[PDB]
Enzyme design. Structure first.
Site, PDB file in Angstrom:
ATOM      1  CG  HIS A   3       6.980  -0.880  10.837  1.00 31.57           C
ATOM      2  ND1 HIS A   3       7.316   0.288  10.187  1.00 31.57           N
ATOM      3  CD2 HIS A   3       6.608  -1.758   9.876  1.00 31.57           C
ATOM      4  CE1 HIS A   3       7.174   0.118   8.887  1.00 31.57           C
ATOM      5  NE2 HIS A   3       6.748  -1.116   8.672  1.00 31.57           N
ATOM      6  CB  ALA A   4       1.564  -0.145  10.756  1.00 36.35           C
ATOM      7  CG  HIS A  32      -0.704  -0.818   3.698  1.00 33.88           C
ATOM      8  ND1 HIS A  32      -0.232  -1.086   2.430  1.00 33.88           N
ATOM      9  CD2 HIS A  32      -0.109  -1.720   4.518  1.00 33.88           C
ATOM     10  CE1 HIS A  32       0.639  -2.081   2.486  1.00 33.88           C
ATOM     11  NE2 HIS A  32       0.724  -2.491   3.741  1.00 33.88           N
ATOM     12  CD  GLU A  33      -0.571  -2.304   8.482  1.00 32.07           C
ATOM     13  OE1 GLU A  33      -0.719  -3.429   9.009  1.00 32.07           O
ATOM     14  OE2 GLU A  33       0.388  -2.028   7.715  1.00 32.07           O
ATOM     15  CG  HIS A  45      -2.121  -6.276   5.563  1.00 36.21           C
ATOM     16  ND1 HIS A  45      -1.710  -6.884   4.397  1.00 36.21           N
ATOM     17  CD2 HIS A  45      -1.109  -5.458   5.936  1.00 36.21           C
ATOM     18  CE1 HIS A  45      -0.526  -6.417   4.052  1.00 36.21           C
ATOM     19  NE2 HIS A  45      -0.138  -5.553   4.971  1.00 36.21           N
ATOM     20  CD  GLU A 101       2.365  -5.779   2.269  1.00 38.95           C
ATOM     21  OE1 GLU A 101       1.941  -4.722   2.797  1.00 38.95           O
ATOM     22  OE2 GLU A 101       2.596  -6.815   2.931  1.00 38.95           O
ATOM     23  CG  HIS A 116      10.625  -3.795   5.835  1.00 35.13           C
ATOM     24  ND1 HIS A 116      10.429  -2.502   6.274  1.00 35.13           N
ATOM     25  CD2 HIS A 116       9.415  -4.245   5.430  1.00 35.13           C
ATOM     26  CE1 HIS A 116       9.149  -2.191   6.150  1.00 35.13           C
ATOM     27  NE2 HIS A 116       8.515  -3.228   5.634  1.00 35.13           N
ATOM     28  CE1 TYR A 133       5.030  -3.558   2.354  1.00 36.20           C
ATOM     29  CE2 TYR A 133       7.366  -4.099   2.446  1.00 36.20           C
ATOM     30  CZ  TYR A 133       6.111  -4.078   3.030  1.00 36.20           C
ATOM     31  OH  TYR A 133       5.917  -4.576   4.292  1.00 36.20           O
TER      32      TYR A 133
END
Ligand SMILES: *[C@@H]1O[C@H](CO)[C@@H](O[C@@H]2O[C@H](CO)[C@@H](O[C@@H]3O[C@H](CO)[C@@H](O)[C@H](O)[C@@H]3O)[C@H](O)[C@H]2NC(C)=O)[C@H](O)[C@H]1NC(C)=O
Ligand SMILES: *[C@@H]1O[C@H](CO)[C@@H](O)[C@H](O)[C@H]1NC(C)=O
Ligand SMILES: C=C(C[SeH])C(=O)N1CCC[C@H]1C(=O)O
Ligand SMILES: [Cl-]
Ligand SMILES: [Cl-]
Ligand SMILES: [Zn+2]
Length: 574
Positions: A314-315, A344-345, A348, A372, A470, A480
């Site tokens: 999972h990323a 998305h990452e 971060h 996020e 999660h 999210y």
């Protein structure tokens, strides 16, 4: 006095750097190489990190935060008074750590095996199946299989995790773990805030839901789709029915204006995981935001290793609290969906980079939703037809409604899902939901918010929430829901800052320095001010608001209403 408070804060930040740095490596060594040795080492660094948390939390509590003049110091010390898991007695703390690690390993190494052949991993073997199959029975096989293997095996661990994390939270002055999590927003009206936001996106979702149900009816047949009822949870192109973009073909408003196969185009053109992260990097620099350090490309794990070694797939994005070392770990596949995840990452990583000069205590998002949302904002622009065509992955009112639909299947559909996860989790933490009502109340919410039913009735022993990363991984999920609302607010602000006129879904902020400036000033704050200040810096106003998102999809809402009306749909599920 005050002088002692800031000596304390300075002492905290420097020792926290070193220790947080040693923890992250050990954590990373486990995440990217799940074996007994890395686990043992991760478990050991956990005691170390806790030894440090206790020493400093105990001191922090000897400060009266009320007597302190400097607000910045006030806020750090107050945060340091939260020991988290380290509030636990040593034996329970060692049990708690073991539980989490066991839940994470269990989830990450789980497989769904055919009777006499292939064993399938969630990424990407089951994921691919969910996305691409259109055979009711294969979808069901993977849907139930994943729940029977990851879900059920998480069940043995959960009630005790729940007991321990609640005890941690009560020991830190909270009523339970959910209250503690909610507290990260510093917003006492959080729940009502989110509920109001959820009510605003309803006509949009009820209309999406009905339209999509009509199309599923058309493909899967009347005997499987009740036109006035919930949609079987396994037909939405995604393991959790959280995003629905993979059934775009079945729902396309105008096949008459056909769109390219993006995955064909990506694979054919020699796209690679590396290239996907390089394009995301480029998008951030187009805006005059920071590039990723050379070391990032040296150290990251951007695709599934071939060693035959187990990883958490999972990323995730990793701050090493060095100001220098930042990493992504993703089992990246070459499709459009993971392109969006790579942005998305990368948001971060950009956030870690903007706030790296702050003290580590304040090295966090204005709120978790902000952390996020960053990469998702840029991805809103990447996903435009005009940007996609320029990447050579795509080629007019019809196309416009197709685009909005595509986006709606991703963004609107996730709204109730992201609302639901922590509605269930908060009610578990506070005792409304017991290990006897886990699965039933999970599906009462799946029905209430999303309008889904399980395609196979659930039996005692099932723990379907355990089938979503999660839950076993104990990462909060409301972040999210906040992400999806606000990112639309950021996009609208950044688009007007970039000078763009007319319908908001047509905006592309690529190369806009004015937009980069807004996001940067906001990200540099880290966790030093309450979030409404960052909200204000980006959008010119301090609230969360659903209006931008309503505005983005307004033309789609009009079209969906007309369309559901003429088919005589009955919105919702009675
Ligand atoms: C309360 O204590 C904090 C932390 O010690 C004080 O904040 C710090 O204030 C200094 C001076 O204003 C900031 O430095 C400035 O920022 C940049 C980069 O360092 C520099 O180019 C500027 O010229 C300037 O030196 C520092 O960033 C800031 N630190 C934090 C963590 O916010 C704050 O001023 C104190 N409040 C009061 C009312 O005295
Ligand atoms: C996996 O763990 C072993 C022993 O703990 C270590 O020596 C090895 O470097 C790891 N594998 C990879 C590819 O890093
Ligand atoms: C990108 C991540 C890892 Se930080 C993620 O888990 N996401 C992205 C949006 C919500 C969600 C999910 O997996 O459900
Ligand atoms: Cl489920
Ligand atoms: Cl959160
Ligand atoms: Zn994220």
């Amino acid at each position: 006095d005050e002088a002692e408070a800031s000596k304390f804060v300075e002492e905290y930040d420097r020792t926290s750097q070193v220790v947080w740095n040693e923890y992250a490596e050990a954590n990373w060594n486990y995440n990217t190489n799940i074996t007994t040795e890395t686990s043992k080492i991760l478990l050991q660094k956990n005691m170390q990190i806790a030894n440090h948390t206790l020493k400093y939390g105990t001191q922090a509590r000897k400060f009266d935060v009320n007597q302190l003049q400097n607000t910045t110091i006030k806020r750090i010390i107050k945060k340091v008074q939260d020991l988290e898991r380290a509030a636990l007695p040593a034996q329970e703390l060692e049990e708690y750590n073991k539980i989490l690690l066991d839940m994470e390993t269990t989830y990450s190494v789980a497989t769904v095996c055919h009777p006499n052949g292939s064993c399938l991993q969630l990424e990407p073997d089951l994921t691919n199946v969910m996305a691409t199959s259109r055979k009711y029975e294969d979808l069901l096989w993977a849907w139930e299989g994943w729940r029977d293997k990851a879900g059920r095996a998480i069940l043995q661990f959960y009630p005790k995790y729940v007991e321990l994390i609640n005890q941690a939270a009560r020991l830190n002055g909270y009523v339970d773990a959910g209250d503690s999590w909610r507290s990260m927003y510093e917003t006492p009206s959080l729940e009502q805030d989110l509920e109001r936001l959820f009510q605003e996106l309803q006509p949009l979702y009820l209309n999406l839901h009905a339209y999509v149900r009509r199309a599923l009816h058309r493909h899967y047949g009347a005997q499987h789709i009740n036109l006035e009822g919930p949609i079987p949870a396994h037909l939405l192109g995604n393991m959790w029915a959280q995003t629905w973009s993979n059934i775009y073909d079945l729902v396309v408003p105008f096949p008459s204006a056909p769109s390219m196969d993006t995955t064909e185009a990506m694979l054919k053109q020699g796209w690679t995981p590396r290239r996907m992260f390089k394009e995301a990097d480029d998008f951030f620099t187009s805006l005059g935001l920071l590039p990723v350090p050379p070391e990032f490309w040296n150290k990251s794990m951007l695709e599934k290793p071939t060693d035959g070694r187990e990883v958490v797939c999972h990323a995730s994005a990793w701050d090493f609290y060095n100001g220098k070392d930042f990493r992504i770990k993703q089992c990246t596949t070459v499709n459009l969906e993971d392109l969006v995840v790579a942005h998305h990452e990368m948001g971060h990583i950009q956030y870690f980079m903007q706030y790296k000069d702050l003290p580590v205590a304040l090295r966090e998002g204005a709120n978790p939703g902000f952390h996020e949302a960053i990469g998702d904002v840029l991805a809103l622009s990447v996903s435009t037809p005009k940007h996609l065509h320029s990447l050579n992955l795509l080629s007019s009112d019809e196309h416009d409604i197709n685009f909005l639909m595509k986006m709606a299947l991703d963004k609107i559909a996730f709204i109730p899902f992201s609302y639901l996860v922590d509605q269930w989790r908060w009610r578990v933490f506070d005792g409304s939901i017991t290990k006897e009502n886990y699965n039933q109340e999970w599906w009462s919410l799946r029905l209430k918010y999303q309008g889904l039913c399980p395609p196979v009735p659930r039996t005692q022993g099932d723990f379907d929430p355990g089938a979503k990363f999660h839950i076993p991984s104990s990462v909060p999920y409301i972040r999210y829901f906040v992400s999806f609302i606000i990112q639309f607010q950021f996009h609208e602000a950044l688009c007007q800052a970039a000078g763009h006129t007319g319908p908001l879904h047509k905006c592309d902020i690529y190369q806009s320095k004015e937009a980069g400036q807004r996001l940067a000033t906001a990200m540099k704050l880290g966790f030093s001010r309450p979030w409404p200040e960052a909200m204000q810096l980006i959008t010119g106003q301090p609230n969360m608001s659903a209006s931008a998102m309503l505005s983005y999809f307004k033309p789609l809402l009009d079209w969906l209403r007309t369309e559901n009306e003429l088919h005589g749909e009955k919105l919702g599920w009675q």
